[PDB]
């Protein structure tokens, strides 16, 4: 069976508890709500019908909040027509967001668009269509040089690469969103935009103030100074999310393949939880199958180690979601199984028992690692590793269950109590045989922590089923 | 600076010796002709367009005539008039060549089309637009239930995935474009659609009785037969072609990655050229800049470890073409730069001493690998496993010269001779501080053939300048 | 302090308890008796006087008793004189027990002699001293042929290479040795001269009659019977004891030092313990100080792994007793602290084991701490020599005195141990009562949870 | 065959042109002359019957001349009687050397003993049989307290440990006996209790003052202050003798061990070859055959890495010389055959050599072939401890000779090596001639290519 766990962004397309069960059965593992789009009845009725499936089956899955998160966008134009932008031309932009646009000027909605730029920065407009070059800044005026050809439609975003952007960490209604999010208990937030570790901790707060303390935090890096930030803005994570197509639109294209490639790196290290997303399998929005490119990039990914591997469009509102989902677990499971174990600063007790615990399943052809934990700390860790053994996660912290579901290659179970070291032993060993990844004569190993406090892994045992 | 080699196809936009000279500096090593298209008189030209900069300028390149090969096409229709086929429709395919095709029926180009199918088995037609299985076989006819709505026109390729398909290795015209090859002496032939070791020897034995016998094969590898008998094509061939394009028509797609992999890997341990080809930044034909997706298949390409990888439309046709050919350049250099050696059946001694050579020159940072080489054996024995360390290779052979250009991270340099080994040390220092690539006071591991027949690499010496 | 254990033989000169409280405190570990001096009632005594200074004290050591093998020796000479063999000269060997001899003929303790040997089988003499060739056999005679001039003296011993003596491992005369050691409850049998694993079933099978199940044999190699047999000996023994002196007299001398280093290492590979013995510090017999050569074999046999070094006479009989035990123990200090851990390794115990040393010494941990029943436990990390001490926690009295034999090894013997959880809260508490790790060190704690006795499963990690 | 090489200190009974071509064929090396026994006139003629049997037989060895270095002994004795000397009695030395000993006092060679010494310095006697404490110093006498029983002969050596003697390193005394091997053109000078670097310098220039600019040093580390002092002596010398009974006198008795062990280690790190010298075989200057403790210490010497053991009186003055060559021979093909390479090493030097040994192994080489104008490759090449001989080609005579006593080579005298490619043509020849390997065999060949002397920079592997 597959490891590497799929992320659907679920639409109005997939919704339904029959879908729902479909998407669960070809291998979708969490369902991401994009909250760009949709009103809180949408989104609460979508959270029950998985939660109904669940309840029915059996099937675990963990729920995804994303945000929206601020932006900069182009405003209106005369007419609501487009109009034809020239290489060579004079284009201005105004943060007076009256101004109805033209071929010479439009509206923007940031107003610390002049204060944040410089002159000879890049301004680009609609996904990168239309690049210009700032050549003065005048009161509410960034005066710009367009470089190419392009038409300009009404609200585009815009991109300014390599600009540090004083915008908030929380568009006003992300805020309300992440109170939603409180009140149905998601499992994780995807929070986009994420620049620098300030807007992490105020992400933090706002889900503390709401009884969210146990909400994950997956931080969306999605341009350069979330990148110079990287290290601080994971520190302060639960979780990365890789955008590489707005990776793409903000730094060097040469680059946008090594900063996924270093993220998903350091995420492992770091024992935190990776997501890797957008333009994964997209010609499916339209195609029965994907094309041999899109196969290879989401192959490449997994073979970088990323936890999770998401669907955006092709799940929530394309043709063929169910066919993304299916071919998306065959590239899976076909990378998956050729991946090896990684068996490679002062040595800490968690590190040294949970290596050694993966060594010596490996040593001793062990199917499965069965770990006790309360957070799921003990359960990333062991992962580190890239065990060829399942990891059996007993649990009875019933969102720690939801929440190791996008750990790649983690079975969470919820369990009613673990009352000592040899009581997890034989509960442990009971639960393997239930689930059938081992059998009578198996080697199993077993990690937990005894005698300490929670947050610590000290203890690794090898039984026979 | 890069070690990855670039083929660049050339054709009416990048014939000129201006843009010739322009693409060499951008990063260009070797031309592709590919035979698919024009005549004997423009090939000429545009390899003599080749050689004028390369005598002019002292730069180097290689020249690689790209075959047509054998194809199975679909034939003409009613009026020249697209036809709208029908899912669930019976459709025929006639290897009646007099036959004008209509909504029902068409005409192959393929004798054997009756032959080669079986009931159950799908064809394809035009790079996979319509799938169709056939239902029976009669006479002349291979009769059809198409699978997906789409419009057939006339000329259409033809896939017959997982069938080994008995046309001959070599079409008739095929024959005579490799006697133009051998009158114009290029240096490599990439030979299309191979599929068993019969197919190389065939084309072995054609080049041979035409002089060209020194010229090297590269087996393009396009199919499900080529890919099972790989191990037997490589070891007949000099090198492979991985194409990724043909290939996802052919097997299933999640295999292709893992095919151009192992390919890649195969050809490193035997010690042959292998390029990678085909949809590599293919959106810059209309476009001034690649795609993140192309990017970033291109670095893992070359993570990989392919020698050399090619555009086609982009540098031959496309209105950008020196853009791609510097884009790919960059990419070159930003994904080579972070690679690192790799120093790992009875242990023969060529390469006991080459991989010594290389963990020598490790160990004591040496820049530069001087190796003396007739045929190219040791120079691409060097170079199996990735030196951090430029490989200067030395010979006197003109062909060894130009077909060194292929291998990664080797600059060939032609020199009038070497009377011994002690003599080849004073050269080779010489000629060493001469390129630039080392200054005094470096470490250079000089590797050469001593009192041994040609084709084996037994002397590894240091030396500091 | 020193790992390696030190034996040493007691004798007239070491019994009291006040000398054996100070042999205790100057690194002995383990009292042999050599049941060739003295009757019952004053090895008894021996034994008790050890287990009263060690319920005085609190020390702790191990109880090791010799049973005699099949050994031959000639007898006594016209007025206790010794006499001078010639290179040629006919000798004879009778089996006639009540013969004096001289410098023509000798008799031997053994009435199978004429039996056993066969004309051309070579005889030797006072430990190789003296070779003979048989050249017939009558009666009750062995009528040799002299190899090489020497003196020979009264009651020596025989040695008759390449010939399987048809003598039982014990001989009804040396079984109550053994039934007194069950008695007593020694520790150990130390079983001379064993040939092969049928001598060794046999000395099991006498123990296993007597009550004695859990006292541990020790095969002493003595002769190149037993070294031909050695892998069929390890076995089915508990611990060898390579008596170097005695195996020299039938092998190559160039090859006993390999013999000695094989049979150490084969003994570390079978978690079973070995004591090196025979011409350790004999000059000290008579001397106060060893010599270079003396200390310097010391020190080899330590790194080759010994477990234990066993002294003799020079504990038993000799003038510097305490002397002995003192410089042994600075030897062993001084070569135990520069050896290293021998992390090579499959069964779950040794994967267990094994990868708890590496985590010791990886985290810098001063103990490893094990739960054992049998001594298994605490045998399988020693066989990776770790830096660390091993504090090896038993509810069995037998085995707490035989782990005292094992290199590196504390043993303690505790009331009870309820659960793995249990052992660890107890563990941490003995760790820092021993003064052998203090207030934030890091132990590695060893054990076998929901399994049955003899196999190690749990290594877990904790923080004093 | 064996790769230890056997030194062997020639006397009487073994000078003869016939005895010297039996030792040789028994396996002796090097020809140690002990320069305090006989005059020049005996000591040419030893050399010369050497040299004429090398010459009939084309055998090859080299000679090595023992320098006399400042040592300090006792005189004379009333009636040549040995005294008994009492723990606590006064007991007086003199620098005056006409007394004549008896229990209460007695001479020393050396007239600044009374200036060198101090009050509480201990002096020992007779390789430390007799312990005394300085208690006061008046005139020309140094008087002592005894700290032990024991008898004082005549003629003992005596040892001052922490105490720096103020005797150069060759006394005017003692530098004939290096201008002679000069004269001789002797291969080794083995210097006598070297102390400190400016010994070694000392006897540097000496050599170069009589054209022996070329000769090797072999510093004798006898006392604790050249073991003080041994990185700085091993720096300037070109190799080093390990007396460890001579050392064992002043140093504690478990550091010697570690010693030896240590100074071999250090002199295979530095490419520079050790001799083991002293207590080897000394019983068999009695027996025909050593013990089994003797034997054992040998194979644990080659063990520890020496490139060369050194016999004493065993092949000088003893009854069995051949028997103990024989026998040494014996024991060094026996525990030679069991060691491994050891391929850890930037320099280039370096590089090359571990890669040539590293490849040598990989492909089965049997022989690795250097060519050496000064030996440096051939030792660099020997410090990995190849299981392949190495074929040593060169055409310096005075290296062929010197290159005898480096562990595993063969040396051979060439005429001529015009160039890289004629030392392959040259070395397959030679490789094939030599019988050390056959057609089919693969040899690597280890050189300089356009570098100076002292660099070894190229590695080719050839068939032969």
Known sequence: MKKTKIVCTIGPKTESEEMLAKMLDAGMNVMRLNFSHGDYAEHGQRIQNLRNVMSKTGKTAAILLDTKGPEIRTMKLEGGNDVSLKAGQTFTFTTDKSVIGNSEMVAVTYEGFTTDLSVGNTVLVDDGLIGMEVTAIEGNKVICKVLNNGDLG?????????????????????????????????????????????????????????????????????????????????????????????????????????????????????????????????????????????????????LDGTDAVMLSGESAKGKYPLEAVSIMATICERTDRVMNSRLERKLRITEAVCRGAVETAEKLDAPLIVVATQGGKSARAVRKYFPDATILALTTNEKTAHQLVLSKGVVPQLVKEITSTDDFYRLGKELALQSGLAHKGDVVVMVSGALVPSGTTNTASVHVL
């Open 154 to 302: 009404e609200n585009k975003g815009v991109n300014l690469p390599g600009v540090s952007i004083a915008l908030p960490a929380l568009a006003e209604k992300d805020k309300q969103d992440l109170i939603f999010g409180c009140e149905q208990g998601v499992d994780f937030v995807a929070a986009s935009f994420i620049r620098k570790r300030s807007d992490v901790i105020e992400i933090r707060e706002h889900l503390k103030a709401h009884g969210g303390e146990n909400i994950h935090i997956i931080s969306k890096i999605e341009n350069q100074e979330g990148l110079n930030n990287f290290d601080e803005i994971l520190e302060a994570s639960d979780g990365i999310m890789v955008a590489r197509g707005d990776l793409g639109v903000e730094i060097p294209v040469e680059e946008v393949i090594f900063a996924q490639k270093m993220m998903i790196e350091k995420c492992i290290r770091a024992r935190k939880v990776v997501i890797t997303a957008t333009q994964m399998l997209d010609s499916m929005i339209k195609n029965p199958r994907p094309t041999r490119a899109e196969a290879g990039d989401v192959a490449n990914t997994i």
